[PDB]
Write a protein that binds this DNA or RNA. Structure first.
Ligand SMILES: Nc1nc2c(ncn2[C@H]2C[C@H](O)[C@@H](COP(=O)(O)NP(=O)(O)OP(=O)(O)O)O2)c(=O)[nH]1
Ligand SMILES: [Mg+2]
Ligand SMILES: [Mg+2]
Length: 430
DNA sequence: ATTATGACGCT
DNA sequence: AGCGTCAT
């Protein structure tokens, strides 16, 4: 009753760039704009592997993870941009720099948590309180929400998508009690006004379009963001959760798309997030552990407490390359040369990071995969990172991995290596 | 031969 | 510390 917390204390937004790498390439090359196009890494094997797809190309069935040759079968006029190659490997610098452009704009409005190269959470609670004081009980005009959808509306008592959007928005705004400065629905609405402004700023100052979700916590904001992509934002209220979750496959919620989500489905004999409400917190904890159980009990009611962390910069800086099938590294000279290539890219990125961000990494993590292992990493070993020198980093990585070499011969490497990975971690202020 | 990352939980 | 999971 009156003591049952409803998880309506915060206003949280999730901003995700639409087809990011594609937009970066379309800004640089206007010939790619408003066209079916995709971004690929490498080229020789099946035309390269697609990692980003414009919405025009998605209409033909083009997806991430698809080989470009296969994509061309679905979309013969598909245009392709290739990721830059440096020191024999894909180099993603252009997209990391474009990311910084966007994240610095977002940081003007509120503290953000960088969740990936193209998305960030925003805690708008305080900004919303400020705007509400400025409004002075003035109603919110639909003109202030020109790209906002209200999930679950319209309802009750009409052909085109924009007319649907506007009808739902008008139903929402008509039911708003702008008198109450602590109404959660009002707070969400003001949050959506601020996010319209943030997205306008991003597009004006970078040329990039994005989508966004506005809700009371990170998981609902993330889910909302995907409901109306591209170039739109969606508000998911606390009240919309029962209907939304009643037909929501468990796998659609962040964290449940893998083995745990499959176990929830299999053990409980359910399919949708809303079915979880029928179990007690102790029941869920008994199946999925104390932490997962409490999280599921709250999440199926729309409640989640994970804070937006004040963290605009990545916590690690890493360099990885796969060596599939017959390109695996089977000599010591090979392994040394590629450790050096990775280490040289890492040195360049670390030196730039130190100059920009006033910090130094102190730990080097070396991960490898050996032929036959189906795991991402076969082995992971750390050593100290005391100088930004690629030859030293690569020599140290070799020293910590050289005992994996089964070959009695000194020149050969067996079993051959199918992946190398260097990761700088444990940053300190400098 | 699905690649290149990044975050975070467990023990 | 080293390994596993999840995202994409
Ligand atoms: N290297 C690499 N980059 C990837 C991979 N997957 C994604 N990226 C890169 C390329 C992506 O552009 C970028 C952002 O990932 P999203 O937000 O998941 N996809 P997007 O922004 O394209 O479309 P949407 O409009 O649906 O949000 O991350 C991968 O497997 N490998
Ligand atoms: Mg995106
Ligand atoms: Mg994203």
């Amino acid at each position: 009753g009156p003591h049952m917390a409803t998880g309506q204390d915060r206003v949280v937004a999730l901003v995700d760039m639409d087809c990011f790498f594609v937009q970066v390439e379309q800004r640089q090359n206007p010939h790619l704009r408003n066209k079916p196009c995709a971004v690929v890494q490498y080229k020789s094997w099946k035309g390269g592997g697609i990692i980003a797809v414009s919405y025009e190309a998605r209409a033909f069935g083009v997806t991430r993870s698809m080989w470009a040759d296969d994509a061309k079968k679905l979309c013969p006029d598909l245009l392709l941009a290739q990721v830059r190659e440096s020191r024999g490997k894909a180099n993603l610098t252009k997209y990391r720099e474009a990311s910084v452009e966007v994240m610095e704009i977002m940081s003007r409005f509120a503290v953000i948590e960088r969740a990936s190269i193209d998305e960030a959470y925003v805690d708008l609670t305080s900004a919303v309180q400020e705007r509400l004081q400025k409004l002075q009980g003035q109603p919110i005009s639909a003109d202030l929400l020109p790209s906002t959808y209200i999930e679950g509306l319209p309802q009750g008592p009409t052909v085109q998508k924009e007319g649907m959007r506007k009808q739902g928005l008008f139903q929402w705004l008509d039911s708003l009690q702008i008198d109450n400065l602590t109404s959660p629905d009002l707070q969400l609405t003001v949050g959506a006004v601020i996010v319209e402004e943030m997205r306008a700023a991003i597009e004006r100052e970078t040329g990039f379009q994005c989508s966004a979700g506005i809700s009371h916590n990170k998981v609902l904001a993330k889910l909302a963001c995907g409901l109306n992509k591209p170039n739109r934002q969606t508000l998911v209220s606390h009240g919309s959760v029962p209907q939304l979750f009643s037909q929501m496959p468990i796998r659609k919620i962040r964290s449940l798309g893998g083995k745990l989500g499959a176990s929830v489905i299999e053990i409980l004999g359910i399919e949708y997030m809303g079915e979880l409400t029928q179990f007690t917190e102790s029941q869920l904890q008994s199946h999925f552990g104390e932490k997962n159980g409490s999280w599921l009990y709250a999440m199926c009611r729309g409640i989640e407490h994970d804070p937006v962390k004040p963290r605009q910069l990545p916590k690690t800086i890493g360099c990885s390359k796969n060596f599939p099938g017959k390109t695996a590294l089977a000599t010591r000279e090979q392994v040394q040369w590629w450790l050096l290539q990775l280490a040289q890219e890492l040195e360049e990125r670390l030196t730039k990071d130190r100059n920009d961000n006033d910090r130094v990494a102190t730990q080097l993590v070396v991960s490898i995969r050996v032929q036959g292992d189906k795991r991402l990493s076969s082995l992971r070993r750390c050593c100290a990172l005391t100088r930004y020198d690629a030859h030293k980093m690569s020599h140290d990585a070799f020293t910590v991995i050289k005992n994996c070499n089964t070959s009695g011969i000194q020149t050969e490497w067996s079993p051959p290596l199918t992946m190398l990975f260097l990761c700088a971690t444990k940053f300190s202020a400098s």
